[PDB]
Amino acid sequence: FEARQRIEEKNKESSDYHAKMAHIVNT
Amino acid sequence: QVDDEYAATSGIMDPRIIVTTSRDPSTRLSQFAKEIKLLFPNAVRLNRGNYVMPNLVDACKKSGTTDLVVLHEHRGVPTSLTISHFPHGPTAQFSLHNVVMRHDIINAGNQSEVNPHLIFDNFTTALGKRVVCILKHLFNAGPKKDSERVITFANRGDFISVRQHVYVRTREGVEIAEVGPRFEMRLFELRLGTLENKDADVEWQLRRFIRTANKKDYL
């Protein structure tokens, strides 16, 4: 249960940060 | 997907089964073999006593048989299983864990052994496809429009679990009763060579001391 909840936290946080750096640049 | 192990024979001919055991079963293991016999249609069984397996399987092959299941145990209760599809088909070697016994609990009616209804739940990867096709080609082709014997395979968390349930289409929905055993079934190898080879093409082995197999399904 620990290892799963870590995987969804890690995936969401990583993807969102890359999405912000996709949200800035071709502005 | 139908395979070269099944393409010429999938819906063409309905199969028969043979149930047997490794060497000198315990009595309860024989009783469980009886349960897995009476669950399957086209059910005929034969005790293995002092038999050379190449001779046994080779003699069973000219007589005509589609598949062969044979069991194992650990001091009374079974732990392992394998399926050998005869026409050069793939042997599959599983670890089975839990069981409920129709003898043990109650006489809850009858395993009517009608051509049953088939359920394969939550299989995605091509290995799930291999398991689905190999196991589907063991059931009878042609249950009726209202075959009340629903066999159930579930593939959550790499531990496929099987039950049997019997339903009646009651006023607002179906209603089911639990029969057959209930399982924690799990594979660990696929070999396209039949077990008489002992050395042929292994399709698949479960990596065990690989780290990520804590998490990952299907290797």
Place this chain on the structure above:
Amino acid sequence: QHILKNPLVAQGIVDKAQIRPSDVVLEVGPGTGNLTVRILEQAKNVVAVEMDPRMAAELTKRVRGTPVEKKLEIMLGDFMKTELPYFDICISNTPYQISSPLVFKLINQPRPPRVSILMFQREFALRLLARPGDSLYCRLSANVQMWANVTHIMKVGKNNFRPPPQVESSVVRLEIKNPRPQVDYNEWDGLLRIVFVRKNRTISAGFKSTTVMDILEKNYKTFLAMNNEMVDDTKGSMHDVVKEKIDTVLKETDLGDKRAGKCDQNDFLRLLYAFHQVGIHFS
């Protein structure tokens, strides 16, 4: 049949609709539910209208085991022949040949919606959102701008579509006036049909055709015969009287010289009232 593949215009269409947690969405032409499931999250109860039972079967397969499984009805058949239930906003992708029926069916509902997010072909939408005096001010704009109000949202360019079609699309928020105003419908439409036949000739031009003077003479006679006031001497047939009658209006309200594709809505009102005042009706 085209498919809105872009997974980011879909969310924007949905959240501009301002769905409240107590709404009944009509969602016309759902497709394969690329769009629907967002509405299922945000509305109490969705009523999807569909014609392809292949799509209906797949769409109702999509919601199985999902918590939103019981908040979706499906109505089959032709959209322009059902009886829509009450619905409270409306979200629509439906293929464009019903774009002009759809709008008026929403305007003429009993208890119409409150906001609707509609997808249209670019030139169609630019008819709908064209103010008086533009190049595109048509009869459609004068109708729809009487009973509704129509506001652009975005451009959906043609490469968000599988397969890519040739025309660009628009997303448009339409919102019905409430109460609907108390001019008639059929008088408004009769007048607009006449004066918008040739959009840039002056208004007195449209009251010269002999089909039109036949129509107005017939209507004026039937109006007098509705009030049972017997008829005077006419040099041709009755349109004689009507002729000077029409001219007199187009002297007083001045409108017999302005060009109908530059006259905004109050001018059509003043013209409608002036013809009503002298005993002319359009249906």
Place this chain on the structure above:
RNA sequence: CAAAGUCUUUGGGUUCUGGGGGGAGUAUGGUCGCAAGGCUAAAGACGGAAGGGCACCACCAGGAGUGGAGCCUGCGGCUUACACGCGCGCUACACUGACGGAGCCAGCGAGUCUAACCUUGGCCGAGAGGUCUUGGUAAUCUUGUGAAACUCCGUCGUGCUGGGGAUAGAGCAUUGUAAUUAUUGCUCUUCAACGAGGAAUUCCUAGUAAGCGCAAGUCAUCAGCUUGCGUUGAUUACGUCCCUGCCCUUUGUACACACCGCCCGUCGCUAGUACC
């Protein structure tokens, strides 16, 4: 292409235009523009009948049992930094027996290079255990694994004895850093229950039940277990539907020759019509 030519890089006069094409996009401290609204309110289905096949979940015959003992062991109580409920196995409960010597028939594979495996012999030590060496990187050496039950005679008389060893203690090797918590192996000594096991109880139809040993632990399960390998080796059923339950039809529907020649009841769909 007779101009789109003017002997390799360029001048006969003069007017005009370009500063880079095509398809998609995104941003904006910029310029010009661009709405409507303030009173109005949905909720065909159901029960029954007969006709043919099926079952160590049926009948018949038994074989092996467990459930008795003792000991190991898989799911259930309670405790620690032990009076227990459901089950699987082995050993025996003795003259077809038990001990002394003689003879002896296998197969499966496994085994070691910069390590010591699997081995042969001779050696000594009751034994346990220590001696150097070749054979083998594999049919070669184990290995013919000279296996155990098996066969002969010997001893013994049914004796809870010599069947039986659960139970302890001591000594010996033997490791390992230590055995200490009898890790293991020999030896001596200790000699419990067990007099055939009720209610029940599972499996079983021939190389079968049953009994015996050898090999290996090859990514899952397994160590007083598992899976192979072979040995010896039987009785009764090979018949039945009486009960139990399962499957097939009710147009035999499918084409001469021999049979017969409506599936039945309840609520249905609709039609008709006497009635108000």
Place this chain on the structure above:
RNA sequence: GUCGACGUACUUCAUAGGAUCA
């Protein structure tokens, strides 16, 4: 107002051809 027409600024899509060998 995720408004339009511009004006600036930027992004992106379209690159392989012959010869020998396998």
